[PDB]
Subunit: 488 residues, 4 copies
């Protein structure tokens, strides 16, 4: 941190005797190469920026804690859940998805809700979105999808034809449950404090006996759901582009700390076999009548970052950062995510990104003899420790009899290249329709959904507009008509 006497130095600690002097011949002659302090400052300035995240480039963050309020040790044996009242420090980063780093907060998008827990068994990242489902169930489709959400390669404008061309392509129409949620007013939250978080995917949690369950996590806001209409969202995007960032910072600064209650839905393997859809399908939700929400604990965000770049922009979240007893299911999208994020951190941040303080596991320090060297190895590189498992040294492997996934499903089959295209019939449209009816219970929302879709589809090509109307007619023909009226 900052030296107490507050002496301004260059990079190598040499004192600067005047803040702005630059050497030249005389008072107004040519600048000299020997002014190394000028080059030191200008060259570090040129290197301030790292690549923005792809996607979720634009975001906000805050520190807090998770607290266990109820017993779930019969579902999960992770140390962070072992005792009621046990707190684990965390870091949450909220974000949008398609926009670049300087884009506005109040636009229509999913919001990310990524939390990092510093547990005794290492860091745990719950890399969640604010929606129960997502647009795809094929991992290979993700580069293609995010490209259509961003800017046209030539015009560099957000293109409504790309957007809707992808989503109305028959094999991609399984995105419809998610398109409904996006274009409802929940696609434009009032702020980060008044939205939910969801695992989306099914995960597998195990207790210490070896009993395991399929789980889905719900992080419900205690401040309550509050949204903006698209007209309010568009006005605020122009007057204050940093509206949600300002709201989170000011709420924590004023002591009005936001909290969320964490719940899980559990299901056994036998129950999963009896469902009309797959537990490995990201575009489906589990019925809360049959599978109710069991309470686990709370997330309170009570501390602002001191430095946004160092603590939030450099923060790295990955679903592969998991503790014992919490594992990923065979959901194809989650499976690919176990590779993608840590790979992105090695590019965006660097080979030794886990040594950056917010990414460092302080409650369970990194120690691995064979993970050494790399650029910007700053923690000492374990000194003279052998670079392999030397026989005259001692090493501890805890929980040796704990299973990773041996005790779970038995798989059978060849290596099949599979494209989980939109199924024949109505199975991938049922839940979008049930959601349309749930919006009928809330006044003004079915009308708003049609308006939100309509003013966006208006920009599209007439051939693509018709495919949008047909796709939505398969959900509800009344909804399809209402979209067309707004679009024309």
């Amino acid at each position: 941190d900052v030296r107490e006497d507050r002496v301004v130095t260059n990079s190598t600690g040499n004192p600067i005797n005047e803040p702005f002097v630059t050497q030249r011949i005389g008072e107004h002659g040519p600048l000299l190469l020997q002014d190394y302090n000028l080059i030191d400052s200008l060259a570090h300035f040129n290197r301030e920026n790292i690549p923005q995240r792809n996607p979720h480039a634009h975001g906000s963050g805050a520190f807090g804690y998770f607290e266990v309020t109820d017993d779930i040790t019969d579902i999960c044996g992770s140390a962070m859940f072992s005792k009621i009242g046990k707190r684990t420090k965390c870091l949450t980063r909220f974000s949008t998805v398609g926009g670049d780093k300087g884009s506005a907060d109040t636009v229509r998008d999913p919001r990310g809700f990524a939390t990092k827990f510093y547990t005794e068994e290492g860091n745990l990242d719950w890399v969640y979105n604010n929606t129960p489902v997502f647009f795809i169930r094929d991992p290979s489709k993700f580069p293609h999808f995010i490209h259509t959400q961003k800017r046209n390669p030539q015009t560099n404008l957000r293109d409504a034809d790309m957007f809707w061309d992808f989503l109305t392509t028959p094999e991609n129409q399984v995105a419809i449950h998610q398109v409904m949620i996006l274009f409802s007013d929940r696609g434009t939250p009032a702020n980060y404090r008044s939205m939910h978080g969801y695992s989306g995917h099914t995960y597998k949690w195990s207790n210490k006996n070896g009993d395991w369950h399929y789980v889905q996590v719900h992080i419900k806001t205690d401040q309550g759901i509050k949204n903006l209409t698209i007209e309010e969202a568009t006005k605020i995007a122009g007057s204050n582009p940093d509206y949600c960032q300002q709201d989170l910072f000011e709420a924590i600064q004023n002591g009005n700390y936001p909290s969320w209650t964490v719940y899980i839905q559990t299901m056994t393997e036998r129950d999963a076999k009896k469902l009309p859809f797959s537990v490995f399908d990201l575009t489906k939700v589990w019925p809360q009548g049959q599978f109710p929400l069991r309470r686990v604990g709370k997330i309170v965000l009570n501390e602002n970052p001191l430095n946004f770049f160092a603590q939030v922009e450099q923060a790295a979240f990955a679903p592969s950062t998991t503790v014992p007893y919490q594992e990923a299911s065979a959901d194809p999208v989650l499976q690919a995510r176990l590779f993608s994020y840590a790979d992105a951190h090695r590019y965006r941040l660097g080979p030794n990104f886990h040594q950056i303080p917010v990414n460092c596991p302080y409650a369970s320090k990194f120690f691995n003899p064979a993970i050494r060297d790399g650029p910007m190895n700053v923690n000492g590189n374990f000194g003279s420790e052998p670079t392999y498992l030397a026989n005259d040294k001692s090493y501890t492997y805890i929980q040796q009899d704990r299973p990773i996934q041996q005790h779970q499903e038995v798989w059978n089959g060849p290596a099949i290249p599979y494209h989980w295209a939109t199924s024949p019939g109505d199975v991938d449209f049922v839940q979008a329709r049930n959601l349309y009816r749930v919006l009928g219970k809330q006044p003004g929302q079915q009308k708003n959904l049609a308006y939100n879709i309509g003013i966006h589809v208006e920009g599209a090509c007439p051939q693509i507009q018709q495919r949008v109307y047909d796709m939505f007619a398969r959900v509800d023909k009344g909804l399809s008509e209402a979209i067309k009226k707004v679009a024309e």
Copy 2:
């Protein structure tokens, strides 16, 4: 380079069977590591972004040409000015300054106007802004200044206290001429087609006989100055963030090509001595009565880029990229800029950034036996050519009798650490005051200037607000009172 048969392959040209298949055990088991096509696509997706420009992160581009319309061979011996009617291919990137890559087009900022001319004597970059002057005359002050134009290190919000604290600091108040232009409606142009371009700095151009002149360039728009008020600009920022990108793209696409007339002011070393201010000062403009504009040619932008990332985002512009007979003056800001841009390019784009097609000197091929190797050397690396000047090989050095700068000023003095702080008295406030006089001729512009400053200053804390009033009071006391009325 799209192959005619349009066979979709992976990175190493191996054909893909089906666009979205990913390997797993059975149809719904875990994903397999042997699916190298999935990893190839996801890993390249993670590496799509390069760091944004610091500053001028957000921008638009277009190709076109320069045409000589008048003879100025008496002033400058560069090959691009030799014949009347001579055309040189160019690339122009327009941009804002403080905002990040995804920020809006219609915000208050200077606009960049950087053109790359592909001449027979290598490339030439006229890295200009849309304003006659700039905020600083000390190069060391630029990291500090851009930081106050961006976001607060903790809150990540754009902060009016930082902004006005830097500009009202006594030794930085020489920024006042530029603050005046910034907060006029010229600070929010209607589009890139209806704004000017200016050298800012004094350059030194010389003819083939060895005679030289201090030169300042003026790129005037043929569509005429058209501005927006701040209420209009703020509505469009939320409504269409890419308003000026859309405007430039559509204008060229419809055949309504934007053009600009290029003009220069010239001056002798003797005339520079009879001047009230220094020719090396960026915050000063040369009076057009004494030094009239002399026409040179035209810039017509008539071609959109095919790929924005490859051709506009990877474009690299530098003051140090200059042709024979065009050199930099001893302006300290320009002197440091001869270092900064190429240095920024090596980091942002890479050591061999000049091998990227838009940055390549196609009309004067790069050849240098000692500039070899480096990451991503893709043009052959001159094959087996000696890595030095081998005596059994031939090397041509053209224009050996042409002087660079030894035929110009003679300097005398020691190496002095100098800070060109705001002069005591009125010399650095005179031109801001006469700029206020010129705005009195245009109806409603002085009222708009005071409004634009007043609504911005309104967000600052009382102490800094008072310093802003005193600074503007020194230009005109009526202006200061008018800003204070809007801020209250």
Copy 3:
């Protein structure tokens, strides 16, 4: 590519007046910042180096061709094997393993024999070594193993204790077959032209009718096996560190082109289950009596690189670079190599490494709408092509119903974490013992094996020396006694 008028320019094509002039005040005053040509040259000089390969940092290369001399279309349906007499251009890079970039050629090590074939179905990389087997059959062991082959973390010296401590650790002693080949005089070849290349792993090749075979490839030298003794190799290591590079360059320059004959061993799925060891085990060779060598073609290297950095150092070889009908087996080491190489290339060379000319698939151009952007995208980035599969555009997917691996083995089981430690009994020592008997037919090679191990083991401390004697006594008690005699 060199411009024929041979005018020396800087990076941006601007002509240099005099090769070595640098600007200063007067003739002997301080250097000026405005000399951008000096900084262009020095800054590019600073960026010449890329990270060396980890491992195989030190090596040599040459271009040539593969020619089909026999019909093996019943085994493999790849286009490169379709006609007898068909030629495919290739690039081979030979190398050592443990040593850094500046290390000597004639040291004891495996040699790499990596070939890239530019086929009509994309590039094919045969990333082979000069030994039939390898040290490990667990991919997780690879970081640990290369670490012990290199330098001690503190002393930075090659350490005989690390080396033998890893290899004599009980669960790693499956390395013994490879330790035997390494310490024979085959571990110090006379040159790259007089050594063999081997697949190591089993691969799965299939014909156009969907029939497949387990295959192992043998690339036999037509120049004949020639080796150095360790005393000769050590004397040449000091005398000429680049002995093998010089030999390959001069042999091709003098027209004495080296060639190798390619043979395959095939096996069906039924034959594999009758074997006393696993086809997925890298430390095992297939008996030639039961599985004879079948000839395929010839590799002839006949053209030297014009530029070593651009063509050999920037070359990228990966097992995952494979053409249709050639796939990897479930060998765990090969499975991890399917990820490792392409990942290393994205770091070492960069995101768009496949755009570097020698890595470019020229006979089957790279085209994929979703693999876009990234630093140093120099081939145009497909221009205005959509960044997804646009419905108003056309895309060809060839060999749509050709299987990748569905037509092969059916896997069954849970996700088991497995460590394939040295098996009980004699099974992992048998082939090491029969290799010792084969060296008994070639006079002097058994004494040399004992000597080569003895002088290396002598540098280890007595506890580790005893474990080495014990491990080799398990092969042959006579061998063990002879190693002990030389080491003491």
Copy 4:
């Protein structure tokens, strides 16, 4: 810092329950994407290497201290020299020049002798060689010269034609004093403890009264000069490539700490005007009769690094890293070096290289409000500190009245493009010849000089060999005859 319980974890602190297990279907089925611990280890392994130094890639290092033993406060006011007996911790890296990272210790080259001093006024780097002079006096000549010292661009072999073609080119022949030293037995030291260090360049040191002197520094070995013959050096280069690394490590390990006595030669500006050559010429030494060695203190190296990579390989040394009262002279080579090293560090190590522990100014902490962000900013990035000089915050600028270089020379002249080619006459050959006579005092050294040049020149082209003989005849015709006799 290794965790006390020695629990092996992955990068994010999650405990590994078995060191080598990798997940697959069944016990011998294909590998799963799900095994993030395998990819964590393999991907970090792929990123262990950073680019080697260019030049001086191969080296060794150790920690120790500098102790003041004599008063020089009348010459230099730097705090590290202020009291007799004052110790300052240091780090020294010794190295060769042209060879790559794996190259041998006992080759013919200059040796580097770079020392970093952790003083109370920041770090100080004395980046010296083990020779009084160097090959060039023009900075632009440096990329060309190092290219000829390394490998041929095509053959990758060290080429005697490149080597001698550059040196015998008439305008480069000022290298002859250095070539004489290089090819004597001083060109192959017995070890790093048996050689001297020299500033090479003239520096300017000032006392607190403003009085200044031109200074040259001599770091004389207390162990005495001890050399190898080229036959001994070539034998050890094959037998033990890490001979000097082993020597330095074991000497410190066994308590036989190497020490050097530091001396300086001082000179006023008036004496500089009376000299027959320039104080700014690197190829000239100052006579010790007239300018005797004045004693300053001692450098003792008494501590080995714990980890070579983190402490020696990541160490960054730069002439621009200097404390108050020590400045560079207008020597054109030193002037360019003020840019080159810190620039190379930004590439090779990263933008925040100064945050790596060995480069950190621990006795005078880095604090600068405007040097922020950048990849791998691990020290907290000064938290919420303003990114500029905020007026409500406090900043200390010490030694405000201490001059940097104003008090020294007054320069006159235009910006001249100058190439300091070999001067006419004998002025650039005189000192090479008196060095030959000093070699005559030692028995066998003039025969060895002729032999060392002869066996190297032998490998060159006949017309280049003739030019070598003509250049050495200009020093001594008997020397030239002896070189010709060995080369044949």
